[PDB]
Design a protein around this ligand. Structure first.
Ligand SMILES: NC(=O)c1ccc[n+]([C@@H]2O[C@H](COP(=O)([O-])OP(=O)(O)OC[C@H]3O[C@@H](n4cnc5c(N)ncnc54)[C@H](OP(=O)(O)O)[C@@H]3O)[C@@H](O)[C@H]2O)c1
Ligand SMILES: NC(=O)c1ccc[n+]([C@@H]2O[C@H](COP(=O)([O-])OP(=O)(O)OC[C@H]3O[C@@H](n4cnc5c(N)ncnc54)[C@H](OP(=O)(O)O)[C@@H]3O)[C@@H](O)[C@H]2O)c1
Lengths: 328, 329
């Protein structure tokens, strides 16, 4: 009787082969996301769960799954997992601290450039077959000589700052805690107040987790302070911004653009979670969107799955998992 | 009697105000490109011309405009301007050496990320209203741990190299003349043969002017060498590549993607240029295109127009324009 491991989404064959000698595998080798009800059913007598972005684990889920020893998350932002409840029940919660960082930072910079330069409309125009040569059109905003503000300066904030080093921009950030002097000085980063960040940045790049303190942090009040025409890029979590306030800011022309890889409709732990992205936001010309593909780099996804798998195996062997989010 | 200046495309009002005290202005303050016949009509008795990327000046053009003393180009690559004919006829030709470099480099890296990460299709999907959370589609290629190859290492090549410093890539390049060692070492650039560049790069970024030597340089022979899935980005000139060879390499799935800001159809000096981009190339999913917007940054275009205007004014005053491309008596 090997301990039962429920894997909620498809995994590489290499990962199944890695886990097989140690676990009874209850797998979902399809392209689909299963219902919460079905996931809960599978986990009833499970000793381990490998969880992904669409998964949500609350105190009630854990209570109904009394044999769970570890939830190994194949992600960085564990906002949909009740860590406190995991700890109270003696359940390890693990994440993937580094592997998602660089692919997400690359995408965020791609979105900043694409948004500033009208990539969406530009490509549509060429693809229409109507291109006849250069025109005095599609004039946009570049990074050279601009001020770029980072909200949050953890892994992704740092990775984005690294990647903007040759770009002729003035870099500033707001964080809860100051970056160490050497890193600040290396990256040419200046620490500013949150309001100052919004008032003086031409590009605003969000790099915050979603928690109680950051929920709707980017609200109407804060957006009212932005330089007219400022560009906002959200590769972190949807609910860090109030998308309705963002749309309003775009429509009044105070916000020059919004680019996002993440959306409020994805934040399952919210009882009042928006069920869709507002069609008016989707239709706005000053936007650029991606469907949570921040870590969707082909080579990286096997490594992410492997990280989660190794953490799960450590927990099942009675070790402290290397990437445990909590302490028991 | 003031010298007549023909400005073929829309400029900022400030530039009109700068020029008006010294020139009779014949303007095109619309978003349209006028016909060559209309431009010739306007330029017949003009002393000056401010020219843009859609313009083409050949021997015949100059012959029809015997009073022209300066053509001030609001651009860097003057491949559609016969400089030899200008020089022979005593006409200054001026360009903009540096201002276009940085915004074009920014775009090219944007195109590299956009192409590698299926940004075009990803955005189309989200906007459909059918987004249902994290999903299995749109897995792509990143720059981290990838080999990035630059063909050419002039202003744009160097600007791109500068901008990729923190990206965790292995950078290599081919040029006719190598950079010095200190620069190569600081930027982590290794010089390789052209064939090796194409056989070993995950991303290939073009940074060449269009001339006799570079016309169709990126042809079937070179594309046949690439790693399955290699991504090609062209921010320089369309005709540096053979777009038919590119399409074929895409269709067989050897070339992973092609992103371009520039197209063979724009290269007016070529008598055998295509008149459009192949519909099949436009229809291919592994592509990302922009309509020659390399320097389309609002603040930069203003400074580009200012540069062309200043050069024109210098020439009309009887002095050598600071950014003259040619030398006269
Ligand atoms: N789009 C994607 O595919 C993708 C991929 C990976 C991650 N993400 C999301 O992006 C988030 C950030 O990722 P990361 O790897 O950079 O996480 P990280 O390394 O934990 O960095 C987050 C930073 O934000 C700071 N912070 C927290 N609350 C703050 C507040 N109220 N004001 C200012 N700063 C605050 C934290 O500082 P303290 O240490 O002081 O709390 C931390 O330094 C993740 O939590 C995840 O939700 C998205
Ligand atoms: N998309 C846009 O909007 C946009 C904007 C600006 C420029 N451009 C285009 O991009 C081109 C490059 O721009 P740039 O500013 O980098 O020009 P650049 O500073 O003149 O650099 C071009 C480099 O290519 C090299 N080269 C010339 N012929 C070559 C050959 N046959 N083989 C290998 N290398 C060769 C040159 O070196 P040598 O000294 O050895 O010849 C030079 O170092 C421009 O000419 C223009 O056509 C496009």
């Amino acid at each position: 009787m090997l301990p039962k491991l429920v894997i909620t989404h498809r995994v590489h064959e290499e990962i199944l082969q890695l886990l097989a000698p140690h676990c009874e595998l209850i797998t979902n080798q399809t392209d689909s996301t299963l219902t919460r009800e079905e996931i809960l059913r599978r986990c009833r007598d499970a000793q381990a769960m490998m969880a992904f972005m669409p998964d949500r684990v609350d105190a009630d889920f854990l209570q109904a799954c009394p044999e769970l020893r570890v939830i190994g998350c194949a992600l960085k932002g564990f906002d949909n997992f009740d860590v406190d409840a995991c700890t109270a029940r003696g359940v390890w919660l693990t994440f993937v601290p580094d592997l998602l960082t660089v692919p997400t930072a690359e995408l965020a910079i791609g979105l900043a450039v694409g948004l500033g330069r009208h990539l969406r409309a530009a490509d549509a125009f060429v693809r229409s077959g109507q291109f006849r040569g250069w025109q005095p059109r599609f004039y946009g905003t570049g990074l050279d000589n601009a001020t770029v503000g980072f909200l949050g300066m953890g892994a992704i904030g740092l990775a984005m700052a690294d990647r903007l080093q040759g770009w002729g921009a003035t870099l500033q950030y707001h964080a809860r805690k100051a970056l160490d002097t050497q890193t600040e000085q290396r990256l040419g980063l200046r620490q500013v107040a949150c309001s100052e960040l919004f008032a003086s940045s031409d590009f605003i790049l969000l790099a915050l987790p979603l928690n109680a303190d950051t929920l709707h942090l980017v609200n109407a009040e804060l957006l009212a302070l932005v330089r007219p025409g400022a560009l906002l890029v959200n590769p972190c979590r949807g609910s860090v911004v109030d998308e309705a306030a963002v749309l309003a800011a775009l429509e009044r022309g105070q916000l020059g653009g919004y680019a996002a890889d993440v959306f409020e409709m994805e934040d399952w732990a919210r009882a009042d979670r928006p069920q869709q992205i507002d069609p008016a936001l989707l239709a706005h010309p000053n936007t650029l969107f991606t469907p949570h593909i921040g870590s969707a780099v082909r080579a990286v996804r096997l490594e992410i799955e492997r990280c989660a798998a190794q953490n799960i195996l450590q927990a099942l062997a009675g070790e402290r998992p290397i990437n445990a989010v909590n302490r028991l």
